[PDB]
Amino acid sequence: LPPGRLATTEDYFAQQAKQAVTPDVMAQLAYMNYIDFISPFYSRGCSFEAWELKHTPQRVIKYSIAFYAYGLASVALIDPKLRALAGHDLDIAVSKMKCKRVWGDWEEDGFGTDPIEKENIMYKGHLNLMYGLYQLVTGSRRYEAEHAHLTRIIHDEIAANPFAGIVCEPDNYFVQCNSVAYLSLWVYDRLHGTDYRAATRAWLDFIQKDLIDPERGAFYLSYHPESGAVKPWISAYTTAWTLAMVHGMDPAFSERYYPRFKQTFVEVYDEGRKARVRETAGTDDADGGVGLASAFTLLLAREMGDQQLFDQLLNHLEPPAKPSIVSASLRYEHPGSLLFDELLFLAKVHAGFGALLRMPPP
Amino acid sequence: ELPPGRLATTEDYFAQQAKQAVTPDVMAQLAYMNYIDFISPFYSRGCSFEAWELKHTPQRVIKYSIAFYAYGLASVALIDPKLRALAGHDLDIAVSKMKCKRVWGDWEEDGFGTDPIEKENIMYKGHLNLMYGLYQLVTGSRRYEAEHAHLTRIIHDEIAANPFAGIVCEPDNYFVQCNSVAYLSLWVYDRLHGTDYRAATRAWLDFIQKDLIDPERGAFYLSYHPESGAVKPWISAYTTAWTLAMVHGMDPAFSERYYPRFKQTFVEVYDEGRKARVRETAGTDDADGGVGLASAFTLLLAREMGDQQLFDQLLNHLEPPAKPSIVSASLRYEHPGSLLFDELLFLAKVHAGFGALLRMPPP
Amino acid sequence: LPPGRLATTEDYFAQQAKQAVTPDVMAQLAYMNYIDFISPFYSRGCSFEAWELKHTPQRVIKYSIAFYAYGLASVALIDPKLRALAGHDLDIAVSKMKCKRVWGDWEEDGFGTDPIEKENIMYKGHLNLMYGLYQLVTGSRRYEAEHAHLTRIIHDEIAANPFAGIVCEPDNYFVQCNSVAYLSLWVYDRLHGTDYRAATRAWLDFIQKDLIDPERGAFYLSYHPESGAVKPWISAYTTAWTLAMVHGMDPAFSERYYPRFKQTFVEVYDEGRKARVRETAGTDDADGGVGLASAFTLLLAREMGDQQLFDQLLNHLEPPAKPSIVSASLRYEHPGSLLFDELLFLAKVHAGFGALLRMPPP
Amino acid sequence: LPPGRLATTEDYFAQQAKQAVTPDVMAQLAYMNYIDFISPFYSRGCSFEAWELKHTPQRVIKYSIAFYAYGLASVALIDPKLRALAGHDLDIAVSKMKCKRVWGDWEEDGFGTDPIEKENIMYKGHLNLMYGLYQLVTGSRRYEAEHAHLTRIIHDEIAANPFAGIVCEPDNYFVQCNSVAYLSLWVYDRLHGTDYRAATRAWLDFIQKDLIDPERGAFYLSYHPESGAVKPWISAYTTAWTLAMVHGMDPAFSERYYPRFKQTFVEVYDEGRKARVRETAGTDDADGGVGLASAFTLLLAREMGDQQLFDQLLNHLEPPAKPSIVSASLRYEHPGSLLFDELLFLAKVHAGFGALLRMPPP
Amino acid sequence: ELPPGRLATTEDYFAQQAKQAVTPDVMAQLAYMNYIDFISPFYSRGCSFEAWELKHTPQRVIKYSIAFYAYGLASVALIDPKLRALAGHDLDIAVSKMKCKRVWGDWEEDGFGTDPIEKENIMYKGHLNLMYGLYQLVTGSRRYEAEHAHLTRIIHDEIAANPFAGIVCEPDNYFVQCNSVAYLSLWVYDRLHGTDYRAATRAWLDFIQKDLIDPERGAFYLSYHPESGAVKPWISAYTTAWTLAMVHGMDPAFSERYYPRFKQTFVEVYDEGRKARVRETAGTDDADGGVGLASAFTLLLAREMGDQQLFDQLLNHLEPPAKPSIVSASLRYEHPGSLLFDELLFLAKVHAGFGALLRMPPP
């Protein structure tokens, strides 16, 4: 237990077997739920005080909510006594995700008045995955009509496109953002016995052509179908997020690229006690770009069962951020990136995307 | 004997009603409330909120500020017959300010509706309905009687319509504190008119004793969410202190049963017995976490239960660091330690008991 | 002539006999009139630059204009060569008084769209007194129709109310504010031979019941007719303003209470050379509340012919404020209160409300 | 050539004989014309970047444009090679003068939606003089319709008023502002053979009654026809501006008062090398009020052919302001007043208002 | 060869096309342009200008920023076939951002009209038209062909309608730089379509040489104003550098005649021949006055004329004080010395010549 660390890696990995979250995870849930008005999961309303206080840029709120939600889904698997609370928070998550504050960039940028109708997989992929996870956790059909409608839109759009998948902004294809959408299809299928996930093989074949550098185990930044262009830089955060989600659909795909990913991007330091992750090739700097390579790699390490790397990354990420528990609730004095408490929460509890898919009923 | 940094003895606060007079520091708080033109909080009926802008009161809290002032004014009316007219006048202002959009408008801004009274929002309309009743008990005026009947009928109907006992605040958030205000407003209505709206109280007291309370610790959980059935797994001291204080006016035995356990669970006596401070939740040594009101609401609860020792301990903790002075016969705190600070200290200093407010004799 | 004092008390009191204002009063008039655009009496328009530069709160602008106006009226009596200028400034005063910036608090507070129609004596009492004074000074009938219309409203409202007088905000009765209104009736009567002032005796009888403490010579803060409440604090500024105005209508009333007022509130200090005024009972602090007790008492001392107290108060008030005459125009580096230059101006020139009433024609 | 001075007084006065502006006047014209977007005479559009960068208050922008324009008219007389450029700048001047940013104070103050219709001679007097000067310089008829319309309005309003002239704001009469309007009538007459200028004699007779102190050679600050009031302070900037323009209409009028004006207001100092100008009587302070007495007196000295006083004033004004020439363009580090570069430019080039009137054609 | 604050040699920039590869620092500039989510300038087609807000680019200049990036991308396409698709993609984004109201809206705000294309405003629409043509040469795509034909016809018609050769920017302001862009857009249209819109070029080149140039100094005057006939009497180095660079792609002999004289008039070599800086006007020793772009546009000109020595001198002056650094394979300047700084340095580093862009072979 180094300074600035709250629990051992062994303890995080044991939560599910012990049917209990660690005290610090509980204290995170308290940050999420406790204080009136300002806690992020206080109400269904279009109130964003929590994100104003954290200074979360508007474009990022949608990811904040999504990643909290994916964490809450694993809380539900870990502790049956917390499943009702998790369901309640996922309900709030879904209802906040639909507020114009969250999606309104789509309109402000000039792309349309409806965030669901065509394109914008960055938003609606997450929303659709959230709808499914809500239902798996709770058994409630509150959103089932919307979920079916959005799942059908996604399916249809995939079928209509010459490339496998869907764009975010018009003409910008991102493999991370697609991975969320395809995973939402697997969840829908689990809930309804359908076969929307059959599209997955063609997508996995496609992202293995020009979009990946197979020797380095890394995806290029984006694809642009009008011109055919693949941006020539590889991206660590892009790859970590993508391999983590793909591991729940096609474990063998991620198992093949994971070791090469590590070789390409991960730097172990401080006599093996720490690790940090380079965002691109041709640099020794860690956490360039959006600054999320290390955080998404923490998640990936959790997904792949790599305790050693998880421990190394968390020794790098957590202590400089200065965690403390005040009134049984977790705060960080110095969050090192965007989506900081969200991604650390998620990675601490994450039961595996495959296990979320197979979640037993309430 | 007067502890350091304190304005009057606990013995003096408790004696106010028997002496038929407020202490000089309570009078000075009433001057802060009433004296200076335009900027005193009870200067006018208008939708003017200068006093709250100067205190930096967040908008979501203004409704509670007005409510707790009002509950204090009601006790001022019982304490000193010569101040009853003034207290009535201030309660009139209280009610009329409580209806300004500045106070309730969060309901609309959050997307929950254009009418703060129509359904849900018991956080707002519970207090408003209690204020309507108290105004009438103090003054004998029927100025708000129509509105009072209309709102009391809405509350009644909504309780009757719900599968759980009570009413939510936001949609799908149930809070026992907020309900307690509403049920109390029914008792006040019944006192004024001879009705039996309060009959719903027993089913509510049975209900909050099921999953919402930890009976061994004497503490309520934070909230309930009827759609999912979830009860948030943290107990809360401010929630419990507020709820037990109000319930004591409806069912004294309920609060007497839980009060000693509440104290064991949350209250930390320190400084060789001279002080006390209150933990907001279990699993922590930190005092006044969360909203930071556990100590202040526990001061009120102590007053309600007649617990002079704990009152004295809490006020020794709360008041001195806040640095009271009286300038021009008016009370200011240099360093208020929390939200609702002068409000709750005023209320607790004068509070005659919710039961005694209920039975308040006419003018 | 102590430091920070510009002229002797003997000189202020001699202005009228010498038919000339002191050089520092002339310099105040220059501050009022000289510089294009930013001087307060530059134009009729709804331009408030002068008050923005002084940081005058909006609620106070109406009193600023009023007290300037009452001063200008005495300038007209003092120097026949300045009477035309004074008339001009009063014209501007009246027209600025009618701008929404001045009265608009009435609407913003929710009390109505018309500042004249009902209640709001705090505004319309002053406006009605200004209309009369304008006419006495100039002989002009520019506002006569409005003056008659407003005088009739005031008269009718007094007649309609069970208590003697008119409220400011609904349910708030203030004796200061009423005193202005009753004085406006005396001025109307002087100009037109009417008997609106007959209501005065019933008002003077009324304010001597629960509204005054006759032993201490002090009025309570306010009265609230719905509840019957009289606020239990006495107020020095309230009483000083009221007694000054009443002295013009019923000199004996003010002569009876003035000595007792001084005993109650006035603190002589610095071996008789200075004085400062406590705002309420039960305190040794001076100039609490709105912070105007000393300034209004300066006015009262002028009204009562009390040279000694005037001198004492001005020794307290003027020097710490650091007067400066640059060009031939008066500025204060450190005004000690609201309405600072207004009230010092007024008190320096004030010829008595009774003398304004009997002002000979142009 | 003292420090902080760019050319000799002898050189400024010789520009017209040499048919060339001095290098520093050229560098001023470069400041006016050179840089993209931020130069004041870059475009016809309603863009005011240049005035935002100088922090020019909105009420003053109309005078800035006017005084630049009067300077450009003299540039046209001085150098035939610069006349086309001067015409171009005057075109821009006229078109910017019509933007709401310039005149909109009229509306904001509550006086009306049309700046031309009635009163507001402060704006429309300058606009009308600018129209005429534009035409004299260029021969273009682009604004001739507007010029005839505005000249008729001015003529009619003079004819309708019981006093000789026109007010600015309602009930404020200023002789400076009138002098511009009357001069505009002389320019119209020169262009069209009309006799609008016949009104001039009645105006000159009028301003010599209560509006001037003939012994001191100084005009009072303003006149207010409703009350009959003349403000009792004399003003140096008011008088300097008025006498300069009147010299182009009735040279004998200004020749009579100029020596007395100097005795009253001008202080020679620094062993005869400098001068500075008091704004009013009863003070030793220089450049009080609006702070323009010295700058307008520089213009007057140029108009009267007083080389000695011009030199003295410029030695006072220019050096403390710290002129710099960078990229062949003139900047002042520390301008000492409003309208600083405008008035120094104007006074450096000014050929006399009489000579502008008699400007030979293109 | 390789001074401090320089990233690659002049010999390396000039060799890019022969080596069919951009230098690492040019690649790092493309990464600044393309890499980070949401804040990179070429992230999306949308009307999002975060990248320009972060650089503090004034709104009036955004149009030029986009244009000069675009001209640079066109040369990237000629240099490296493997980057041509990327360049096309970025040009697509360029065009679509150029059409946002944030870019052109000054036209409306200034009072000149609601439509930026309809008339005048060659400052905007000249660049837009050149961008349309370059997009099509790089990609083969006809996405903008209709708009390109429409705008090319407007320009052609307006030239034909005017008594002077060319088109104004603001009403009654004629600038030769701005015109040079428009005429060059006609040549690109003609390349793509076999038309003869470029025939107007000869009359324009004769015109700008009769009244708007000082032929001994090799320098254009600042502007022309047809209503008055006025030519502003100051010569301008940035105006001349930009104009001669573009004219070199249409009439090489015209620029070859004036280039040496331009240099004598404005260019100051210093530091024992290792550096150079450019005076903006005559009658001054100060460098980079006015808009402060003389040196940067002269850098471009030097590249266009094949003048390695002057290019090297200018870049030794411009680049090091700006403090270039490569962080995560992406180029940042700590202290950009002017407006359009990274744009113009990018452009000049890659610029293959306007004549070579015109003749660009198909994909």
In short:
The first copy, chain A, is mainly alpha-helical and 362 residues long.
Can you describe what's shown?
Chain A has one domain. Helix content of chain A is 53%, strand content 7%. Chain A contains 17 helices and eight strands. Chain A has helices at 9-14, 23-33, 49-53, 58-78, 83-97, 100-103, 105-108, 121-138, 144-160, 175-192, 200-207, 236-247, 251-265, 293-304, 307-317, 340-349, 353-357; strands at 212-213, 218-219, 223-224, 229-230, 266-269, 274-277, 323-326, 329-332. In chain A, strand 5 (266-269) and strand 6 (274-277) form a beta hairpin. The radius of gyration of chain A is 19 Å and the shape is globular. The two termini of chain A are 35 Å apart. In chain A, 57% of the residues are buried.
| Number of β-strand runs of chain A | 8
The radius of gyration of chain A is 19 Å
Largest sheet: number of strands, sense, barrel closure of chain A: 2 strands, antiparallel
Taking the alpha carbons of the first and last residues of chain A, their distance comes to 35 Å
Morphology of chain A? globular
The quaternary structure here is homopentamer
Number of domains of chain A: 1
Structural class of chain A: mainly alpha
Strand content of chain A: 5-15%
Can you give the helix content of chain A as a percent range? 40-55%
- With strands numbered from the N-terminus, the spatial order across the biggest sheet of chain A is 1-2
Considering residues with a beta carbon less than 8 A from a beta carbon on another chain, report the largest interface and each chain's count: B-C, 29 and 30 residues
Give me the number of helical elements of chain A: 17
Tell me the series of helices and strands of chain A, N- to C-terminal. Answer: HHHHHHHHHHHEEEEHHEEHHEEHH
Active site (chains A, C, D): 36 (proton donor/acceptor)
GO cellular component, one term (chains A, C, D): periplasmic space
Protein name (chains A, C, D): Linalool dehydratase/isomerase
Catalytic activity (chains A, C, D): (S)-linalool = beta-myrcene + H2O; (2E)-geraniol = (S)-linalool
